[PDB]
Swiss-Prot record:
GO terms for cellular component: extracellular region. This is Cutinase 1. It is found in: Secreted. Catalyzes the hydrolysis of complex carboxylic polyesters found in the cell wall of plants. Degrades cutin, a macromolecule that forms the structure of the plant cuticle. Allows pathogenic fungi to penetrate through the cuticular barrier into the host plant during the initial stage of fungal infection. It comes from the Eukaryota. Disulfide bonds join 18-97, 159-166. Belongs to the cutinase family. It is an enzyme of class 3 (hydrolase). Inhibited by diisopropyl fluorophosphate (DFP). Keywords: Disulfide bond, Hydrolase, Secreted, Serine esterase, Signal, Virulence. The lineage of its organism: Eukaryota, Fungi, Dikarya, Ascomycota, Pezizomycotina.
Amino acid sequence: DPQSSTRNELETGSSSACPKVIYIFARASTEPGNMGISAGPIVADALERIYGANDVWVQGVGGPYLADLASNFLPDGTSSAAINEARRLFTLANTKCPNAAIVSGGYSQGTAVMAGSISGLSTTIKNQIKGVVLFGYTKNLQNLGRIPNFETSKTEVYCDIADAVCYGTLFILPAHFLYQTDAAVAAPRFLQARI
């Protein structure tokens, strides 16, 4: 499969051609584009082959989400700027396509983007988000395995045991990508079952 680290299908999408699924993703620290090159596109590919590329809009959280190392250490685990950009994309999804199933994901830092943005969204927009997958959730223990104010039923955390940040340890840049299987198999099935 082509690997596209920049996906802007919500941004450029027409409210005259709303898809069945809108898939929004926040990448890990240091990853290129707005999708990164690991869990982001793996999930993108996996969903597009469940429903067809035409019936899924794939959107990265780019712009002011720079995915830098320093932001992991801030109280929220990422920047306010990144959180606000993700809020803006969720709102744009609801605005453009209120009847579409929103699903989203985050890997490492991108999970903090997801937690911080989604926790602040309206009842209406949250209800539109059918499922959220959090690979290497860096605030896992701190946030009690959930996104605040977002249904735990619609939320899945993926942690590998070699991932100490999932389990309270202060942030370290992951030396290895640990979520190939979770991203390829478990996550797209969890999302599909909520669409």
